[PDB]
Write a protein that binds this ligand. Structure first.
Ligand SMILES: [Cl-]
Length: 164
């Protein structure tokens, strides 16, 4: 079980443009449209990333391509980020996966911002960090998912995602 599986569950699939809890338009597997207003607007953007008049509807494969891109992009940021890289290099797979998930959902520069919590994972101080993240707007914004991502960090296992 990997990161792809992990985010599938954490973000779900949608083949027709939609608005998330956060308000933003979304499509595929949690692939957001960093676009303001009108769905149209959203669409244009989509169409752009897709290279076709889409009408806010895409195929599964098109959804898969975006997924792949976004992930590679999460990973590439961690790999090029001087603040995240050391940490990453430090964890176990599972724990790396958790790392990705966060960058994936919140961006490399958002993650890089958990200064102290990053330190704690880096010093294998699981619970402390665990607990530390538990404040956070992040956590506070999406409690179930974070919960999941946090437990992973905590236990270093795939329990949180087990049967689903
Ligand atoms: Cl996607």
């Amino acid at each position: 079980m990997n990161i792809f599986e992990m985010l599938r569950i954490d973000e779900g699939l949608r083949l027709k443009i939609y608005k998330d809890t956060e308000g933003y338009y979304t499509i595929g597997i949690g692939h957001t449209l960093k676009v303001d207003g009108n769905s149209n607007a959203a669409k244009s953007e989509l169409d752009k990333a897709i290279g076709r008049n889409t009408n806010g509807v895409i195929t599964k494969d098109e959804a898969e391509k975006l997924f792949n891109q976004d992930v590679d992009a999460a990973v590439r940021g961690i790999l090029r980020n001087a603040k995240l890289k050391p940490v990453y290099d430090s964890l176990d797979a599972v724990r790396r996966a958790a790392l990705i998930n966060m960058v994936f959902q919140m961006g490399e520069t958002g993650v890089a911002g958990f200064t102290n919590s990053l330190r704690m994972l880096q010093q294998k101080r699981w619970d402390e960090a665990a607990v530390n993240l538990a404040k956070s707007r992040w956590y506070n914004q999406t409690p179930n998912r974070a919960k999941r991502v946090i437990t992973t960090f905590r236990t270093g296992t795939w329990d949180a995602y087990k049967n689903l």
